[PDB]
């Protein structure tokens, strides 16, 4: 309607914002008329005196979404701040969230290649990805939160997603498998494995085998020797059998330099383990 666009040209800034909200409800049907008047809505978003800037940005972002220009739609959706709710089950919000995660993962991947150019990630884009990861964690969809955390290169949210999961050993085994199949970079794979070793040590029943396998991928014989020494000094016969099982499983992987370095760092059971 050219009546709402005419109301945006009037000096009553609040009434212009009301016309913009009227075009928002109607953005799905009236986007072809509103697209001709984008420069007027952009000028209302740039105007510092306007208290309803986020609503102008939200109308602009919806118009760019219907135009198919998702990058500009995302830039204006980031401008809308609190009016862009991640809780809304709208096709507009889903497509922009998917695009926001993809752009965020792309920028994080590039920022890790260029050790010399800190690509300035918009803090608003990070805050949307945070809220989405928190939503996935609240929904009990830990596997999805872990996938997104790995793509986003965010180790802290990966630790949060694992520690909240009802099935800690299943989530960790999934993380190990995903880290081997999808993480093409060695440096980042080692950082994920170092985080997994820290998470495994916080658990009440540490799976010492999965820890020793992760430590073997990290080439850290010091940590394995300390775990074997702790298990050997335990009074329980079960912890001693577990130490021997770990020793057999380490030998099955045939990394001779690692096995010799583990052996030489070990300060009747000790003779059996050395054998």
């Amino acid at each position: 309607a050219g009546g709402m666009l005419a109301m945006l040209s009037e000096h009553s800034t609040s009434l212009k914002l009301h016309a913009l909200s009227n075009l928002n409800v109607y953005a799905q049907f009236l986007w072809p008329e509103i697209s001709t008047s984008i420069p007027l809505l952009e000028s209302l978003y740039e105007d510092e005196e306007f208290s309803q800037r986020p609503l102008a940005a939200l109308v602009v972002s919806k118009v760019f979404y219907f135009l198919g220009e998702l990058n500009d739609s995302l830039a204006y959706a980031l401008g809308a701040g609190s009016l862009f709710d991640v809780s809304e089950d709208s096709d507009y919000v889903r497509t922009l969230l998917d695009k926001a995660i993809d752009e965020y993962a792309s920028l994080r991947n590039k920022s890790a290649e260029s050790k010399e150019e800190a690509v300035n990630i918009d803090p608003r884009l990070e805050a949307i990805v945070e809220r989405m990861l928190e939503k996935c964690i609240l929904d009990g969809r830990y596997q999805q939160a872990m996938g997104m955390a790995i793509e986003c290169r965010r180790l802290d949210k990966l630790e949060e997603a694992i520690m909240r999961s009802d099935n800690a050993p299943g989530s960790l085994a999934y993380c190990i498998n995903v880290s081997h199949s999808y993480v093409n970079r060695r440096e980042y794979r080692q950082e994920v494995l170092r985080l997994l070793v820290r998470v495994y040590q916080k658990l009440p029943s540490p799976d010492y085998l999965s820890i020793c396998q992760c430590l073997m991928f990290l080439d850290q014989p010091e940590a394995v020797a300390s775990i074997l020494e702790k298990l050997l000094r335990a009074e329980k016969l079960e912890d001693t059998l577990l130490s021997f099982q770990i020793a057999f499983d380490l030998v099955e992987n045939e990394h001779q330099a690692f096995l010799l370095n583990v052996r030489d760092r070990l300060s009747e059971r000790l003779t059996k383990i050395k054998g």
Binding site: R141, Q143, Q144, M146, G147, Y174, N177, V178, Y182
Partner: peptide, 30 residues
């Protein structure tokens, strides 16, 4: 597991992607 279907699908798609250069090489060598 739920995220596995997407990760595996991406792995296979990426693997098939190199097939473009693979075929292009033979299209000229042939």
């Amino acid at each position: 597991d739920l995220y596995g279907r997407l990760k595996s699908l991406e792995r296979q798609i990426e693997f098939k992607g190199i097939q473009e250069e693979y075929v292009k090489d033979e299209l000229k060598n042939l």
